[PDB]
Design a protein around this ligand. Structure first.
Ligand code: 0EI
Length: 352
């Protein structure tokens, strides 16, 4: 029963895990949960273990935790999180407290990668894999809308996985008591301005990541959506009247009433100084990288490149492989914390 489990203090937290998981060491502790590295003695491989403490404790944690468990079963792709295991040490719904998630151990997140100079081979391979993952989600009917470096992980061999499935179709009120601050620098204008969106909402986030890889700074920092919008228009320019007409008349009022900005060309935004461009190879790849940035970092989604088109772009297309690109492949729920506990328990136990 519970002799299948042991308890060890990993930093501040107590981890109670199956005895197959050995030599726990803390990686991360924050909003989602606490993560540790372990050796899995049954599979003879290194794994990451994420602890969710009482994920049913409010409707935000609860909706996220449930969505993640369910959506895992709708995705089969090497660039998206796969679970090796999920378990709870508690034996009844009454006692049920914690869910543990187990997956392949990765070496770093894309935050650490951004702090490094990458050659064009590594940058384009990372972007290629991000797009493969996003296409897989899109073909499953999942539009992410919150892709960001901290939820993307890599191995030393430059292989990449996306860890999370983004925002609810309808989220509504996401209030929580915490110092845990959500990072929104990578969210599309559609998201920021509460517009309609389609698949290429996620192309804006890839743009913000690719731009950050090149600049080694956040493109669009800011305390809040106001700051963020200002940083967007200062660099890309005020968007055309055409785009304003698609805004709610009240956001439209705010946006159309900001100071106008001409906006900078992509050469200015991403000068030659930032690029590997010594050899003829690297000069050409430098212009192709800028060309792709200029098509992804477009405010109007009707003018922004699609996933399928980004995969056909010469900067990316050198990696193109039908098997990875054309690999074949809930949100409307509002519950009390009592009902969520049950829904999550049934999914962990696999009761239904
Ligand atoms: C969104 S947060 C998250 N959730 C999961 C997850 C895990 C299991 C699941 F089933 C599902 C999800 C993961 C995950 C999944 C698979 N592998 C990993 N690996 C891993 C290995 C190294 C590493 C990181 C992550 C993240 C960053 C990291 C954190 C730390 N902690 C420190 O405090 C470092 C230095 C502190 N110093 C300033 C004093 C030290 C090394 C660090 N550098 N790189 C992490 N992540 C990070």
């Amino acid at each position: 029963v519970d002799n299948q489990f042991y308890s060890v203090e990993v930093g501040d937290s107590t981890f109670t895990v199956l005895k197959r998981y050995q030599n726990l060491k803390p990686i991360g502790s924050g909003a989602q949960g606490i993560v540790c590295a372990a050796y899995d003695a049954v599979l003879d491989r290194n794994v990451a273990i994420k602890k969710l403490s009482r994920p049913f404790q409010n409707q935000t944690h609860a909706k996220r935790a449930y969505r993640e468990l369910v959506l895992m079963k709708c995705v089969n792709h090497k660039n998206i999180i796969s679970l090796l295991n999920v378990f709870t040490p508690q034996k009844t719904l009454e006692e049920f407290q914690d869910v543990y998630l187990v997956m392949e151990l990765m070496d770093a997140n894309l935050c650490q990668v951004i702090q490094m100079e990458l050659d064009h081979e590594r940058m384009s391979y990372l972007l290629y894999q991000m797009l493969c993952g996003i296409k897989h989600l899109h073909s499953a009917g999942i539009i992410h809308r919150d892709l960001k470096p901290s939820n993307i992980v890599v191995k030393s061999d430059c292989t990449l996985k996306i860890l999370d499935f983004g925002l609810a179709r309808t989220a509504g009120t996401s209030f929580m008591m915490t110092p845990y601050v959500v990072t929104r620098y990578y969210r599309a204008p559609e998201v920021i301005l509460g517009m309609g969106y389609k698949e290429n909402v996620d192309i804006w986030s890839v743009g913000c990541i690719m731009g950050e890889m090149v600049r080694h700074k956040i493109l669009f920092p800011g305390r809040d959506y106001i700051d963020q919008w200002n940083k967007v228009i200062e660099q890309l320019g005020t968007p055309c009247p055409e785009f304003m007409k698609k805004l709610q008349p009240t956001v439209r009022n705010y946006v159309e009433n900001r100071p106008k900005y001409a906006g900078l060309t992509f050469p200015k935004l991403f000068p030659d100084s930032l690029f590997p461009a010594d050899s003829e190879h690297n000069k050409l790849k430098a212009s192709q990288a800028r060309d792709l940035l200029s098509k992804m970092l477009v405010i109007d989604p009707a003018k922004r490149i699609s996933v399928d088109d980004a995969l056909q772009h010469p900067y990316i297309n050198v990696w193109y492989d039908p098997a990875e690109v054309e690999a074949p492949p809930l949100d409307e729920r509002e519950h009390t914390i009592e009902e969520w506990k049950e829904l999550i328990y049934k999914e962990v136990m696999n009761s239904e």
